[PDB]
Amino acid sequence: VHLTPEEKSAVTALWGKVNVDEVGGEALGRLLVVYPWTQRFFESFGDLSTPDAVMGNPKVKAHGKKVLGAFSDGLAHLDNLKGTFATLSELHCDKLHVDPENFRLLGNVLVCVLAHHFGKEFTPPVQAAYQKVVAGVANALAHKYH
Amino acid sequence: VHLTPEEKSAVTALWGKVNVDEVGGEALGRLLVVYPWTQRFFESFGDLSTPDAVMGNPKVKAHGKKVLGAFSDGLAHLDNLKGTFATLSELHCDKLHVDPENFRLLGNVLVCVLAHHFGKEFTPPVQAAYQKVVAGVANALAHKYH
Amino acid sequence: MLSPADKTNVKAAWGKVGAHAGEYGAEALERMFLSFPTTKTYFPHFDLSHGSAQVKGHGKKVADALTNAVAHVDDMPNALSALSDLHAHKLRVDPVNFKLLSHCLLVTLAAHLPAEFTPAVHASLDKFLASVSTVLTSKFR
Amino acid sequence: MLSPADKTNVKAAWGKVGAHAGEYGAEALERMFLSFPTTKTYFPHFDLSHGSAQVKGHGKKVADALTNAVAHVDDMPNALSALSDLHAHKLRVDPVNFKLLSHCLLVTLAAHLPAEFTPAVHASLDKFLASVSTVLTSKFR
Ligand code: HEM
Ligand code: HEM
């Protein structure tokens, strides 16, 4: 986004240690648990009745991996998140009717998961850079709403 | 921001009708009245104890005209707000220490003031152009915070 | 919390709305749709065209609810329980959206009540709308 | 509204914080200053440098009040009256900022209570910080 080479490195390097599979299933499940109203989009996933039920739901897990997947690919175009997510931005608007606020909630969930995972390694300065990334991604995703 | 030519004309046409002196005093006064916490920056202005005290305060009125004066100028450089507002941004940050949320609150108050004053002339779509405008200024004023 | 003053201000200003609440409710929606387009993601099933009967009908519903809260200004949590439940469990509108409508409700009133839309009334109406929103969102989690 | 499970969850998590609360207070502030540089507008009289004794001491201060609120999870309003006053009439911090500190506090706990930071505990703590926020900004106007 407006990441400092140093900030760029920090993101880049932490990410290389990330198991997208696991992180994505956890980000998306925590989202459905902490902010229950986000479940309005996943009725078809099944039983989201309990934390246990969300976290275990494989439809959830698999959607999480698909989401982090795309996010992951986006960290490769940090200079053009806008152009990187244009089609996903129109999809989310025009087909899925997802309020961009959701993009923001996930971002924050995402940061809590990384801290959870990397403990010590997820320093204030490393968090600061991730925050700029999640905000940049949500902004790019909301970009084509009309 | 994202102002269509027709949004730019609509902004400009109405602004021609505005009495910046009066609107300035009205918007600032109303801010200190609706979001009393905002009074934290004006303890040298005297009595802000009641609505009349605020609204009628010679100092609040004078400051308001100063703020809307700077704002009117920004309306002529709709192309380069960040540029236009840079020194003011650094000042608000470094000297005044004004949290940028204040700038969004004032934009909203201003939109209510224009609605108050123009009645029906302040059409749904005229308001949409002004919302983009007040958001751009607020962004422009927060750009140099660090 | 709303003070005696706030309550007088709100009953007074809403009093003036009178029979126009319906139209003012619709107007607030349109303003909302044009200025904050993300709000539309909640009405995919609506004709959001200018003068949509759907919007018209929706405006009355919102207005009738506000009128009902003024009527029960001393028991809003109870007077609005049903709507609180609906929003919490069915619609699941993100909280941030409430602030957007409030703002647009304020603009519509300003535009319609020049004489009553005083600094003091503005302040009271704002607090009021915040109160209603808080209620409608109280059961979210 | 905090449920019985929530209060339980909160009491457990904080229980583990223990002698480290001050340190976590401090780290959360540090994380906030860095991630949301606008929050620094309220601390112009502080040395915001890493390991600043001012930040340290304030960290302690914030932690302790949090502690006090867990202890009075049942009577927060009353337990934090003095604090809601200070914030509403003296400090006058914009309400938006309360969400930033809250988040940074979650982040800090996540980073330090791996085993304890489950999805259900995460939820409860969030709701808690939100309740705390509400109390602290209830006398704003
Ligand atoms: C980091 C932000 C996000 C990214 C990169 C992202 C990306 C994606 C991708 C790649 C798909 C695949 C669908 C397709 O290509 O046809 C998808 C689908 C979808 N996303 Fe997003 N997403 C994000 C956030 C969210 C959030 C926060 C929600 C809701 C809380 C959401 C709701 C959905 C839904 C409902 C679908 C459709 C799934 C299906 O077809 O069953 N997305 N998203
Ligand atoms: C549209 C947004 C705004 C514009 C264009 C603007 C413009 C200005 C200008 C031109 C000055 C005087 C500069 C100088 O002293 O060299 C000023 C001063 C100041 N502004 Fe802003 N302002 C805006 C919003 C605000 C808001 C919302 C607040 C507070 C809630 C604020 C707080 C102040 C203060 C406290 C001063 C200094 C007053 C004094 O002389 O003691 N400003 N502003």
Ligand code: HEM
């Ligand atoms: C203080 C503000 C609000 C009030 C008083 C209010 C009131 C109502 C009422 C009375 C209904 C109709 C329920 C019925 O069928 O009996 C309704 C439905 C609805 N509201 Fe809310 N609401 C508010 C805020 C919002 C916001 C901010 C949004 C989203 C932008 C929203 C989205 C909806 C939707 C999508 C429906 C269902 C519409 C339909 O399909 O007919 N509401 N609301």
Ligand code: HEM
């Ligand atoms: C989690 C919610 C919060 C809690 C529990 C909290 C608690 C406290 C406490 C216990 C004090 C010290 C009171 C004393 O000196 O006796 C304090 C002071 C203060 N707080 Fe709040 N606070 C919270 C949120 C915030 C936020 C978000 C900000 C600004 C971004 C803030 C800004 C301040 C400032 C500027 C002071 C005075 C510091 C000084 O001058 O020493 N507080 N707060």
